[PDB]
Symmetry: D2
Subunit: 207 residues, 4 copies
Amino acid sequence: SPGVVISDDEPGYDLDLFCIPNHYAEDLERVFIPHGLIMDRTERLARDVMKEMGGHHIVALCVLKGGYKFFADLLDYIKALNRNSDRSIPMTVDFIRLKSGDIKVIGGDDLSTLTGKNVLIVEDIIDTGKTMQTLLSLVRQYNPKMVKVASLLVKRTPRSVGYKPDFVGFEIPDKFVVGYALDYNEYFRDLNHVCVISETGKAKYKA
Amino acid sequence: PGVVISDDEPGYDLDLFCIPNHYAEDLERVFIPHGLIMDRTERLARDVMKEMGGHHIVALCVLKGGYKFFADLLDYIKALNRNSDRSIPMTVDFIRLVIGGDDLSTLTGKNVLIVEDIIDTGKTMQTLLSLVRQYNPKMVKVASLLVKRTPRSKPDFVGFEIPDKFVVGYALDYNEYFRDLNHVCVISETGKAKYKA
Amino acid sequence: SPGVVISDDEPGYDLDLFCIPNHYAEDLERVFIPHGLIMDRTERLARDVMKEMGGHHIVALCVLKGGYKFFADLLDYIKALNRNSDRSIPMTVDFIRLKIKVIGGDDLSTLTGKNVLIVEDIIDTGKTMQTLLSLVRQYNPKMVKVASLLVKRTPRSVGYKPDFVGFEIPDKFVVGYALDYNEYFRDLNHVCVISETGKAKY
Amino acid sequence: SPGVVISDDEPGYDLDLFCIPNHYAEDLERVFIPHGLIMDRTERLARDVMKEMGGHHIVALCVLKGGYKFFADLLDYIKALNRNSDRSIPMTVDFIRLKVIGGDDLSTLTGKNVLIVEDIIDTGKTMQTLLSLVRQYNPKMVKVASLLVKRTPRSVGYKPDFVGFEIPDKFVVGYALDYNEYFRDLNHVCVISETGKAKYKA
Ligand SMILES: Nc1nc(=O)c2ncn(CCN(CCOCCP(=O)(O)O)CCP(=O)(O)O)c2[nH]1
Ligand SMILES: Nc1nc(=O)c2ncn(CCN(CCOCCP(=O)(O)O)CCP(=O)(O)O)c2[nH]1
Ligand SMILES: Nc1nc(=O)c2ncn(CCN(CCOCCP(=O)(O)O)CCP(=O)(O)O)c2[nH]1
Ligand SMILES: Nc1nc(=O)c2ncn(CCN(CCOCCP(=O)(O)O)CCP(=O)(O)O)c2[nH]1
Ligand SMILES: [Mg+2]
Ligand SMILES: [Mg+2]
Ligand SMILES: [Mg+2]
Ligand SMILES: [Mg+2]
Ligand SMILES: [Mg+2]
């Protein structure tokens, strides 16, 4: 599934109709994906993941920083299924961050711990697909039973990387979005909605 | 005016959300996702407290269809109230069209919030305002999850303004069915026929 | 399934460790059952209900006013089960108030042939629910079950036991989570023991 | 405040009263702190944090791994406060694992209100070490929030600024707290059975 298709001409929502941190009011243009919509989609995704990856021990990899909200919420919905259903399997977690002869993968346990396990990579957004590709390579060379990619967002943008994510929250236009742990120079992570920055905000927090 | 939903709103694919399977063939699209309703209701809760938070609030639930909006709106208002330096009492009552119009005498001198699921003709809102005002409250306000763009009809708090199409879910029914649905949805052909009177 | 048994010597919780409306502070003794504990218990109760009643159309009957919160949350947990399971059953809802005479509600004949779930806030003597069942039984439901958030241990009990129980409590006067004292404290999200200095005010 | 003080004689709750993942049914002995109770406490703690620290830019620092759930939930409560307030403050987040592994540049802490979030304080060694590091970079302030504080004679004598629960000298798992990486996928804080400990023993 490509996930919830958010069309290129999606207008989003007026900021004044939602609850927002008032110190971001002029830094945002529109609410793009309301927090609650993310929850509803993430509920379904949790079931899709259990459908495909259930039946054997899952190792859930959180891609920091931007993946942490989606990760926490996805796993909570998975946990909700597993304690209210007959079908259930153990799930362990790990956290990696890519470096701010290529990208260093900060942290993470011994790579042998993924061997023989159903591995779920959880990302915030697929743009160039290079983040996803490096992580797929970094996991595959330790022979898990399977590797799957969950991503909150996928941008409709030209991509050389072939692999398509297995679980997708929303497929969005090529707009620069923030919120729900997605940042602009470390700001907007505390926003619960996904929003499009304004040119004002982009200039205000520019590094 | 609330969150304005267009006439050409395509809604969302059912297969992208969690829905009860027994309605899978009776629904066409998800129209307003549950989470969107929650987000909008969080904002409305803050709006309500800004206007009415100065004195004892009586929240009046309009059964049946208003029960979920009522429960959620109140929970958000309760959340604000227990995290504020200054709080006010809140009490509740329930009416259905007038059933439960017995001992509304404690509406007197209070800030009364009528909570409805949908305003279409406005006849329900009109009827309840007429009744509540006779108890001489300190104020009367109306919160409605949905307002339809229909010639018939104003509410003080509005979740969403929707087209003139038939919606179900989030306690809104079609012949008493579809209330057990967290989303607001558009009913299919088979659905309207299957649950027809 | 008697529910979470709360002992006579349950100390409850200091009010200052939780969030509560500040105007209720002097009127409460302790938090007795935290909101979250109610949610956790209600979650399990939802699944118990579906295992027992999920084979056929459910009519969820809310006993206003005190039963409304438990009703709303219970059904929400039941709804979560229903939309995430391969199998699922229709559910309708109705509302009545007991003043004993029944106020409001659909025609009793709508309950016929259905699995009827009666949702209540508290059972004390049990006379209220016993009378209610005696009326509903006359219209031949496939099944009638009662879910009560609270059940009091008391010799005043006539012997009626509900089918689903949140919490079995001592004979203390509790308020909150839609349970009231003269229409007050319903806006409390926890169940709390009311003060004698609050009992006298309201 | 020392938080919610749980006694050495705390019996916990029977597993059959709550929703439990079936792959841990044999491995767990008892629910110790229900998930909802944690939420209720975390809500109050969110308000305490903002009262103290909500006057300047807060840097929320998560101590991986076991702190991640408490961190995410505490932040969500703080975010809820912040978006429903006339005056709002910016918040940034960072993650670290203890040798301190992979954080932001330590220079980002300077002049900020740093909130360290941990799952449990036991010997206090971990936190005194971390606090020694952070203070060398002259933050405006440094507070510590820990979900649990263990009541043990084995303690350096360190007390965090915000405490969820003070527990007995017992081994607990759940709510991201682990036993050999297991039991993180559990919403409740619980006590493992002897059969569970042997099963997941290194
Ligand atoms: N907040 C945000 N909003 C966007 O619309 C966006 N598009 C790309 N990116 C960068 C996302 N980025 C993922 C994480 O980048 C942050 C790494 P940092 O520069 O060390 O903070 C690249 C995804 P890709 O490997 O598939 O191209 C965005 N970030
Ligand atoms: N389920 C549903 N979907 C709709 O799109 C709709 N439009 C009007 N109505 C009738 C709603 N109706 C309110 C509820 O009618 C009684 C049914 P109950 O509230 O489910 O017990 C009249 C509103 P009005 O006095 O402003 O015209 C609709 N119902
Ligand atoms: N708020 C509250 N706290 C208590 O601790 C309590 N104990 C008994 N009751 C009264 C319960 N109940 C009467 C409920 O009062 C008024 C109905 P409402 O409109 O839901 O508030 C009798 C049940 P029974 O036929 O099994 O004896 C209590 N109410
Ligand atoms: N799961 C669990 N249950 C316990 O009751 C417990 N007590 C100490 N510990 C180990 C906590 N430990 C830190 C481990 O933090 C959890 C993150 P992890 O290292 O990724 O598992 C030392 C705290 P201290 O320096 O104040 O003594 C426990 N773990
Ligand atoms: Mg990525
Ligand atoms: Mg970035
Ligand atoms: Mg109406
Ligand atoms: Mg009752
Ligand atoms: Mg730790």
